[PDB]
Symmetry: C3
Subunit: 149 residues, 3 copies
Amino acid sequence: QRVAAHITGTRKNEKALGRKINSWESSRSGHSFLSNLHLRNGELVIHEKGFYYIYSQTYFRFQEKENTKNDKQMVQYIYKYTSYPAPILLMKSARNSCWSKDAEYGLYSIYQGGIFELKENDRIFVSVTNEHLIDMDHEASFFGAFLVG
Amino acid sequence: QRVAAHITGTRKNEKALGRKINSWESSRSGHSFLSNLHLRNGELVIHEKGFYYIYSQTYFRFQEKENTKNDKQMVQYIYKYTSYPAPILLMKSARNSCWSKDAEYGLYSIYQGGIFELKENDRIFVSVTNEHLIDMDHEASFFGAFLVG
Amino acid sequence: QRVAAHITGTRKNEKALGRKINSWESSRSGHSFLSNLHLRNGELVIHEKGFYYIYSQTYFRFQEKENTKNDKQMVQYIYKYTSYPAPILLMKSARNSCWSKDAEYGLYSIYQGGIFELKENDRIFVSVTNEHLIDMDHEASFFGAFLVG
Ligand SMILES: [Cl-]
Ligand SMILES: [Zn+2]
C-alpha cells in the first residue's frame, strides 16, 4: 500500500556505462517524496518485492568551431543492483545532437520507463553520458518508481 | 477504485509559462475518458487525494529564408493549481528544432510523466510554447493521470 | 491482481500504418515477463477487462550523398484489435532525422504511453515506419502494459 517514489534534481565483471547521477534531492522537499522505498547514495532501495514501473527524465541542455565535429551522444541508462556482482542494465534511451554547424544550443529532455520485477534490497539508479550537460532543475530531471503489483 | 483519466486532442505572483491547452476533448468520445476525475476549462480536477502518475504527449509538427534564423524551443509544461495563489510547475520537457538550413519540416512528439501527491480539488493542466505548432490529432496529443496509491 | 507485461527485443477497411513488430521476445527471459496477459504473433492479448497503461520504446539507430535528401520520418504506432474489423490506432509518436548534410549517424529512441480501456481478448501491438532502422536490443526497445483499475 503506497509504495512509490519521485526524486528530483536539486536545481559479472561488467561495469555500468555513463556516470551515475547521485545528486537527487535526498530531503522531503515537495516534488520529491519516498513511500516504502528509500534513497541511499543516489540509488532507490526496494523494500517490497513486486512489479515496479520505473522511470526517469534527464534534461540535457547546452550552448554550442572550425574543424571541430562536436557530435554528442546523449544516453540515459537505468540500472539495477541485485544479488549479482555487476549492475544490470534495465533500459537505455539515446539521442544525438543536431549536426548543423549553425547549431547554437541544444535542448534534449529524455524520458523513458518500463515495468520490472524487483526483489527486496534491490537498488536502482540512473546514469548518463555527458553528465556535465545535465540540467538538474527539479521540474526537468527526476527519477521515480511505483509498485504496480 | 478506478481513479484515472485520459483526454485527447479533438483532431505567489509568478505566472505559468507557455500557453495553456484548453481544447482537450470534453466529451466521452473513446479514447477519452474520465473516472473519478473531471475536466473543467482544460484542467483535470482531482476528487481523491493521493499519489498520481500524471503524463502528457504533445505533438509539435510544422513545415519550414535568408537571414532568418528560425530556431524553435518546443517545451511542454505540466502545472498544478492547489491552495496557493500561483500555479506550481510539476514537470517540463524541451526540444529544439533542427538548425539546418535544409530543414523542410519538423516532427517533435514530446512525452513526459511522473508521480505527484495531489489533494482533493487540485487542478492540473498542460501548457506549451509555440502552441500554433501543436497537432491536436487524438492519437498524437493527450493528457492523463491515474491514482497509484 | 498482478496484471502486467513487459516484453523486449531479442537483441472498417482501414489498414494499420507502418510495419508491425513481431519479434518481441516470446520466452520468459528476464527483462521480459507476462502476468495475466499473453503474447501471440507479436500482440499482447488481454485476459481481464479494465484500464491499462500501455507503453512502448522503439530505438531507431542508423549510420548516414550528393542530391540525395535522406529525410526520415520515424513514427511509432500503438494499435488495438477489438470486436471491430479494422485495427484502431491508440497512440502515435514521431520524430524527423537531422537535416544536416554533415549528419553521420542518428540515435532516436521514441517512448510513449497512455491509459486505455481494454476488453477481454483485445489485442495490442506496436508498428513503426523505417523498421529496418530499429535496434532490437532488449534494453532499448520494448512494449508493456499494466492494469491500473
Ligand atoms: Cl536535429
Ligand atoms: Zn539537425
